[PDB]
Amino acid sequence: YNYRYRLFRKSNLKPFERDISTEIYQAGSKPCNGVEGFNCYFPLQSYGF
Amino acid sequence: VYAWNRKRISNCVADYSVLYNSASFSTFKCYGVSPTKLNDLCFTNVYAD
């Protein structure tokens, strides 16, 4: 279960671009300021391996 | 909920944009994209129950 990938980003990444950012992503519904809630969630996951 | 029937919603405009913003239920989750992305889509019908 250690293998990480990203579900949400403000734009798609460029050729051989990379992004270390964790954050809580906000879908414009509320400025949730680094804590989860309705329409705002942590954007990294790891697989159900 | 284990044994009920379901039927198509069709030929009328999918309010998924308002359905994404609205806290109309205690939780929601999706097989395809987020509801804001579903607000850009179409189908012959959505089967529902």
UniProtKB/Swiss-Prot annotation, chain B:
It comes from the Viruses. Changing S26F: In strain: Omicron/BA.1, Omicron/BA.2, Omicron/BA.2.12.1, Omicron/BA.2.75, Omicron/BA.4, Omicron/BA.5, Omicron/BQ.1.1, Omicron/XBB.1.5, Omicron/EG.5.1. Changing L19I: In strain: Omicron/XBB.1.5, Omicron/EG.5.1. Binds to host ACE2. RBD also interacts with the N-linked glycan on 'Asn-90' of ACE2. Cleavage of S generates a polybasic C-terminal sequence on S1 that binds to host Neuropilin-1 (NRP1) and Neuropilin-2 (NRP2) receptors. Interacts with host integrin alpha-5/beta-1 (ITGA5:ITGB1) and with ACE2 in complex with integrin alpha-5/beta-1 (ITGA5:ITGB1). May interact via cytoplasmic c-terminus with M protein. May interact (via N-terminus) with host bilirubin and biliverdin, thereby preventing antibody binding to the SARS-CoV-2 spike NTD via an allosteric mechanism. Attaches the virion to the cell membrane by interacting with host receptor, initiating the infection. The major receptor is host ACE2. When S2/S2' has been cleaved, binding to the receptor triggers direct fusion at the cell membrane. When S2/S2' has not been cleaved, binding to the receptor results in internalization of the virus by endocytosis using host TFRC and GRM2 and leading to fusion of the virion membrane with the host endosomal membrane. Alternatively, may use NRP1/NRP2 and integrin as entry receptors. This is Spike protein S1. It comes from Severe acute respiratory syndrome coronavirus 2 (2019-nCoV). The gene is S. The chain holds residues 350 to 398 of 1273 of the full protein.
